[PDB]
């Protein structure tokens, strides 16, 4: 840990972790409604296991001027198409999934 980079490197303000999520069963759609997420999908005769690339906060932010600001890191989302279920309606709908971790700024005093 004596490498210069541990000092002169480019750092994140908020630390994240990225994983493949494949056990997702529920999610909320573009309308904010809780919908069911299937585990496989049929894209042109080819059965696919539904997987998602998700990034979330690694559970105040780094480099912030704490004299003047309260702050914290938080997980933000993206909308991605997915085979879901609303009744006997299997559909190709956009759902909400973790995609980044950003710093939320807040003035103090």
């Amino acid at each position: 840990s004596s490498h210069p980079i541990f000092h002169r490197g480019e750092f994140s303000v908020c630390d994240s972790v990225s994983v493949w999520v494949g056990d997702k069963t529920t999610a909320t759609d573009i309308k904010g409604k809780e919908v069911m997420v299937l585990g496989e999908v049929n894209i042109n005769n080819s059965v696919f296991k539904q997987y998602f690339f998700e990034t979330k906060c690694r559970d105040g932010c780094r480099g912030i001027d704490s004299k003047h600001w309260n702050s914290y890191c938080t997980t933000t989302h993206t909308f991605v198409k997915a085979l879901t279920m609303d009744g006997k309606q299997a559909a190709w709908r956009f759902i909400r999934i973790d995609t980044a971790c950003v710093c939320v700024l807040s003035r103090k005093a």
């Binding site: 210069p4 980079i5 002169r8 480019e10 750092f11 994140s12 990225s18 493949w20 296991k49 690339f53």
Partner: protein
């Protein structure tokens, strides 16, 4: 005291009148002082360092109205500080350059003085244009008279300098010999400056004035990035020019555990002279760098041939998990280092 001096109030020695320094050095009362007023005397012709023999923190020195005419490059040597020096209304034909030797002197009064304009005043010339020592306003002019702060300009210059490195490359444990050619007309002192060559056996004094010979024998790699400079001082000013050596040795290389920061990074440190060309392998095969996976060098540190950096990976996945190999190559051959990196578990 009182008798001819020492009035003032603070750290002041005031003797605005005839010279009486004969006993102002043996038992004056206080080697300390800050202002000296000698704008009036009968003697004082040759002002040397001895005339100032006496450690002191002086900021104001007045030697206007007197008789001084020859101030050898040394004088004020004692007073390390000195911001204001008034030598006005005197007999001083010319004031040698080396005198000021960057003493941070803020004000320099030279005038009503014969001030025969020579090349040995191009320095005051500069000081007027550059508007440095509060020379401008004084409106100085030449004695005999070819009148003033005008003046043939191109006919005064600093000495020229080239230093010839061995034309052929070098390798460790050789003899590196070289000369420093100073070409001008003022012609005074010369001499190399070694910035600590503790790792090599230097051999100078091999020159006079037209050239200065310097040879390094049984040369270690610890010569690299160590400025080798040489002097030059005409009758008006100084020029120093400096070159370097470059001794070659084989490539060495190491990789560190991959680390996730903003971007992922596989840190690396590589040395070698000549500096080696780099190439990466991923699982034994050529890895072509992209906008998302590329090599990045940190800024090179002061005098050290070693380079540090990272193979930067912009949001790599499990498909990037594997053995990364860095290959450092130069004339001597090649060094290699490998490391396994896992960025994400696979499905």
């Amino acid at each position: 005291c009182p008798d001819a001096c020492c009035p003032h109030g603070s750290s002041g020695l005031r003797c605005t009148r005839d010279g009486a320094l004969d006993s102002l050095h043996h038992l004056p009362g206080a080697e300390n002082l800050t202002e000296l007023y000698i704008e009036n005397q009968q003697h004082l012709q040759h002002l040397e360092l001895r005339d100032l023999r006496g450690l002191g923190e002086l900021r104001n020195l007045t030697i206007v109205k007197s008789g001084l005419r020859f101030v050898a490059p040394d004088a004020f040597h004692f007073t390390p500080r000195l911001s204001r020096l008034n030598l006005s209304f005197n007999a001083l034909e010319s004031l040698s350059w080396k005198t000021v030797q960057g003493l941070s002197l803020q004000e320099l009064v030279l005038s009503g003085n014969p001030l025969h304009c020579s090349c040995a005043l191009r320095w005051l010339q500069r000081w007027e244009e550059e508007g440095l020592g509060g020379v401008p306003e004084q409106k100085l002019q030449c004695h005999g008279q070819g009148p003033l702060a005008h003046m043939p300009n191109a006919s005064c210059g600093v000495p020229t300098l080239k230093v010839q490195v061995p034309n052929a490359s070098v390798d460790v444990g050789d003899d590196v010999l070289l000369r420093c050619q100073v070409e001008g007309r003022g012609l005074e002192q010369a001499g190399w400056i070694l910035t600590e060559l503790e790792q090599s056996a230097t051999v100078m004094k091999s020159g006079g004035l037209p050239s200065l010979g310097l040879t390094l024998a049984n040369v270690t790699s610890d010569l690299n990035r160590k400025n080798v400079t040489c002097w030059a001082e005409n009758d008006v000013g100084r020029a120093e020019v400096s070159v370097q050596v470059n001794v070659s040795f084989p490539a060495s290389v190491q990789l560190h555990t991959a680390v996730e920061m903003h971007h992922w990074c596989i840190p690396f440190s590589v040395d070698g002279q000549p500096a080696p060309s780099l190439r990466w392998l991923f699982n034994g095969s050529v890895l072509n760098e992209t906008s998302f996976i590329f090599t990045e060098f940190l800024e090179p540190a002061a005098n050290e041939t070693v380079r540090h950096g990272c193979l930067r990976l912009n949001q790599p996945t499990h498909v990037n998990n594997g053995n990364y190999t860095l290959l450092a190559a130069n004339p001597f051959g090649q060094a290699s280092a490998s490391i396994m990196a896992a960025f994400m578990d696979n499905p």
